[PDB]
RNA sequence: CCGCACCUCGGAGAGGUA
């Protein structure tokens, strides 16, 4: 009897077992009110309850087990970690703790945890022993990351423009800047079908912290995968904490050797909640930005980086200009110096209608030599110096009309020559 | 269970209510008050 | 003897009824003692009194029913709610309880509710079962809202380039971004009228927070719905008070399947009631703006969603800029980000009486094809792509000359053609 | 605690104990 499965059935079902056992009236109640009661019922029995959840370490020491599903939002309902299994088990934030569970007892208000059965969808033996991710050692890009489907469908005509400006690989470091109304939510959208079609493996996550909720539910139900989201109806407190959550989750899964991507599009909200966050130190630079409030974000993007043990840490954030406030001018001009990739898109082939409007002459990316051969360089080299004489509009014009032809890359490579 | 006061009943189970409330659970409310309210006491 | 027929005949009747009964002398007594005195009177002899109003919980547990006709202003004449009813039925505030009430008896101040008959304008039992608005699915806005009258009057001008640069459905949350001397007031009545003409079955609610007496009283006398006003002759608790009353109001209607609409007209003067009434916390950000007191204003806006299962809350604010005051550009570019919906005015044009001045090139609407067939798209996309050469007081000029010719946007979009 | 924004420690009465 998981905490996880029982949260995901629908109101009416839970109802229905309520009533089946025997308890209260449960219509007027609460669904966390009913799975406490079926908790406390089901345990009268005699059977064991289990649950699972990653762990909020608090600052008096203790910590709880929050749930993916509610990005983990506090709640009174949720799995107790007592600092003394802390001690034990040298548990940190972020570790997946799943084991056996007890309903609390008179005067407790939170599930108690006994014994933990898995760490990290692992063996607790071998994240008992581990080295950590201040121990390994960085690199640069060196696997490719190839966003090309092959299908020759008309979508993939971003991922092939995409990788003939920008091409990514494992453990990247890059920043999407684009004024806003450029295109950015369905851009993202198709980076994610598309890391989740042609590199299953990897873990892809969605952070968008301070949007709408309609493009909230919209991405949970179009992408395949995990959409942690914060509105902008939750305090900036509620946006750090997520952040937080959210990178000690990527950290372990590193550790874990596990391939995590990460799609940022608020790290502008992101640097503004702190900045909002940070208690008033005395200093304040150009644009009303704090001294310390930049330290977080720009930890925050340069966590991202290759592992030679095992695993990688994509980021590619998603950067916002010309958006009529002077701070968000100086935090972009200040995170343009920390990265080392930049795909621009231009406002002036958006307003043609002509989608995608990426600007490939701004594009690019740094060691590119690393993630692709010697062919392909040469390749993407004579494409850059035949287009760059061109213009912007009439480049991706070009572009278009050349990649309609065919379906893959490598025949308009072979009808280059 | 059939046709007969239960009908009335179900009716006179308000009227029972409110008078409960009326005389028990008014009574409990000034009481309520009385324990939160101040006590008149020397200048 | 209904409280609304009660509160609603002149004093003379009253008067004159109370002269009959053999009360105290009238003459000299308030319309709402008159009343009182009757309603003892009447209640001494044996009969019933009926009232109603919405519910406003206290911090202290208990709360009071504020009537509709003072804007949710505490007044003698409340009717008390004891905790032990609230405890019964689970109230919540913004419930609408209507239903029989006692006089108060010797030591009581306020009217006591004997039994509710009807609960939010519905049976108890439907609204004592029911599903929150936090549970509810979020949506974009997929029903259309046609604000064209289609009478062929000279008013329909505005409602018809209005539905040209932005048209408007069920759930939209859009901001009216204004310099002074813009009009305003005369759109926001224009849009009432043709909501209340068009779609008299949407809830209709126009807020105004921190406005003149003169405008309330010709808002209330001109529309044809509800309006709830707060004067500056208020406090900022009072503007706090009234604007949480509304959000509850409107809150309980959607969770009833009801199509609500607010047409708020004062968000930073909501915004500036929130950061006088919130406790100084010893940071202020630029302008004078409190770091927690932006949260409670954005959760009012945010509030507007589109809902699947039934129901939807519209929110159109109005922003104000260019008023000399930096705290309110603050306001307004803080705000700019959030919605999705930008209607600004053009003073130039406002200037020289060419009414209504509305900038067609800034205004736009997001995922408008959700709104909008793929004809009406395209026309659209085709009178932009026309317009959008020419100059503000110009392409006014034009479309009204256009708009003259013919009665209907569907003659001239076919000889455009 | 004064103003957010980068060009060359007392008195009376009542009851009781020895």
Redesign the pocket.
Known sequence: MNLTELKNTPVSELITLGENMGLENLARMRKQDIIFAILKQHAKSGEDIFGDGVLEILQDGFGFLRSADSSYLAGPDDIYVSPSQIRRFNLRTGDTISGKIRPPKEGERYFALLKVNEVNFDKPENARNKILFENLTPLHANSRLRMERGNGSTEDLTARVLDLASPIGRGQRGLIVAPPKAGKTMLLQNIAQSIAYNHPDCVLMVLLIDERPEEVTEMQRLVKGEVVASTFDEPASRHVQVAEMVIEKAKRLVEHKKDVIILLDSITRLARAYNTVVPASGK?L???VDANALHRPKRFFGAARNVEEGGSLTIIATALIDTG???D?VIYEEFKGTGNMELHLSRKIAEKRVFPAIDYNRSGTRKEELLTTQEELQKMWILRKIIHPMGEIDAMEFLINKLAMTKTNDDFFEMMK | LTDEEKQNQLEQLAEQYDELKHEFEKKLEAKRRKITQGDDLAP
Chains 1, 3 share one sequence.
Do not use: L, R
Request: glycine fraction near 24%; avoid cysteine.
């Open positions: 304040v150009t644009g009303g406030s002077k701070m001018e």
